[PDB]
Amino acid sequence: NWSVEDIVKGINSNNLESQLQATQAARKLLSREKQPPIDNIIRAGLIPKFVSFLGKTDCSPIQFESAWALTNIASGTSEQTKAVVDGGAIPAFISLLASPHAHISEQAVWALGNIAGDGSAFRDLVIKHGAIDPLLALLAVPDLSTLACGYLRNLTWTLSNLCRNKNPAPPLDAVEQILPTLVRLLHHNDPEVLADSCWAISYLTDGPNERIEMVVKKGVVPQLVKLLGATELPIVTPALRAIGNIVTGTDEQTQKVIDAGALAVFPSLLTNPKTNIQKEATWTMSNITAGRQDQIQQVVNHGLVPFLVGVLSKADFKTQKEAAWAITNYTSGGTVEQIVYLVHCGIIEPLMNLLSAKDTKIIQVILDAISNIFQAAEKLGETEKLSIMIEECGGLDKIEALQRHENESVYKASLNLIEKYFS
């Protein structure tokens, strides 16, 4: 390839063809090397020139080459992305969305996706410059299957970045404007379009219940549940994140997930070979057992309590901690008979074994659960029998062991449980 010095000499020539060849040499440098010399290109002052080339409608080749070069600069660090924005790229790329040449319009889509992907400020600045209307207009066809596959994938990914991040969340009216197109993309059968559409939905559902509501009322939950059962891990991961986000909301929002059949997938989610799936699925379960006692009953009816015993028994510790929360929540909201069923499934022994964990919060979660189970036992006339089970699990004397424990917090029930039940 060319040196940066030669690229600079060609771009400074004021000869449009010499500038085109130098811009192509810059794009090859920026797209071929690993460790492309982005900072050298920026320090040479080339970004304003590339941005001006985006406006040369009489030379579509140099529009494409400079769009590609700027895309890759914008894919770098936040400082490198800011250099592109500072050079006036945002409104120049938005104008290029109207190009008659699909390869040029898609490169502008890509560049705006990298700029928006930097964070909420540049995301919102891309929106303020008017990107959403022309982006959605590229998708306004009766059947998405008539669009080129790579083109559609790039549009979906850029739209997902406009749905990105949390502080703040994207403007409400932008979300409302994008959502119908996003729901179309969620139903499009291409694995990468589905993955990125799912990511967008997971972003939009991560936040307050009002944000969750505007997604749920578009009717997407049954489609998320279908995707929750896909074979592609890049689809299952964001679908599960979105389902998990939705059940952090109200009892009605949680009930839509259950009504759609999500619990039938959890036997495989809670045994999934990928640790991050098990953790995410067990966290979602803990927010479902924090629901109404008829929602707990659905967990029971789907046979999921043995799977929670399993995760509590053997799993990555972070997943085991989420399972302890699931149990405490269950014991906290469940009926006496639901708590009896939990004990009959073998919850006591794995729950006692985790009292040896060096994490302090799981000990407090587990001792809350033990407390909740004893009050159920009290209501039945039945307490002493529970106490017997605990000590044969070794759980008794690793409870006393916890009255030394540093926390005033673990101190409470450690003495409470013994004075009130054991001794």
Binding site: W68, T71, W110, G113, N114, G117, N161
Partner: peptide
């Protein structure tokens, strides 16, 4: 934690 892609070839 950003989300960006270069175009390679």
């Amino acid at each position: 934690a950003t989300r960006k892609r270069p175009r390679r070839a």
